[PDB]
Amino acid sequence: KVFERCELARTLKRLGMDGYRGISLANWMCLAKWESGYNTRATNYNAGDRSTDYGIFQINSRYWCNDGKTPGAVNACHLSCSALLQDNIADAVACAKRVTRDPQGIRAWVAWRNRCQNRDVRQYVQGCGV
């Protein structure tokens, strides 16, 4: 599923993402936007380390979900990576929350550092009723 902007903002809000561990909804929107273009079935294989990024938040298989084909990987969200390719984003949200409970917080995603950190992200939630 490819979410429309405001539809996603409200979906994330309902799922408890607004201000989760101090992270604003606009930051989450900026992350999903640059990671997958709001596409839940987005996937990116990393030939260098044999891992794959899954879903709307492009969560990686080396540490967060199990796909059975990533060498010496772990599954911190305790989910099949398939759960990160569903139209319904609840599991992806639970996993994204798990990622941020770690030391880096939202900085775990390099894309957020490149395109969201110290940027004006107000535009992502404007007019969405959140």
Side-chain angles (χ1 to χ4, degrees):
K1 169 181 181 175
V2 181
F3 280 82
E4 288 194 71
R5 183 174 65 92
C6 291
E7 175 195 12
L8 178 65
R10 285 187 298 272
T11 299
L12 289 168
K13 195 173 195 299
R14 282 188 288 267
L15 291 166
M17 292 288 256
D18 196 4
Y20 185 79
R21 300 274 292 164
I23 305 165
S24 67
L25 200 61
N27 274 291
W28 287 116
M29 289 293 297
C30 180
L31 175 66
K33 174 61 179 45
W34 290 102
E35 284 296 356
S36 64
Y38 308 144
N39 179 10
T40 64
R41 52 128 60 210
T43 50
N44 179 62
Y45 177 60
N46 303 295
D49 84 323
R50 303 192 162 179
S51 71
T52 302
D53 304 314
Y54 296 88
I56 199 170
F57 296 123
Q58 289 290 274
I59 290 166
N60 189 260
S61 57
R62 181 155 298 290
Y63 323 90
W64 312 107
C65 63
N66 180 44
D67 58 3
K69 54 170 171 46
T70 310
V74 293
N75 181 8
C77 293
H78 294 100
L79 286 174
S80 161
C81 296
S82 171
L84 302 185
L85 301 182
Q86 301 178 75
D87 275 9
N88 179 286
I89 65 169
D91 293 324
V93 167
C95 187
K97 285 174 181 184
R98 170 61 183 85
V99 177
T100 68
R101 289 180 207 137
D102 266 19
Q104 288 179 286
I106 192 67
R107 283 154 169 83
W109 287 271
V110 182
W112 181 86
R113 282 133 81 176
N114 306 337
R115 348 279 298 212
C116 308
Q117 181 178 172
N118 304 147
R119 303 249 192 186
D120 183 340
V121 293
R122 289 178 162 78
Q123 58 165 316
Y124 295 99
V125 294
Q126 304 306 273
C128 303
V130 296

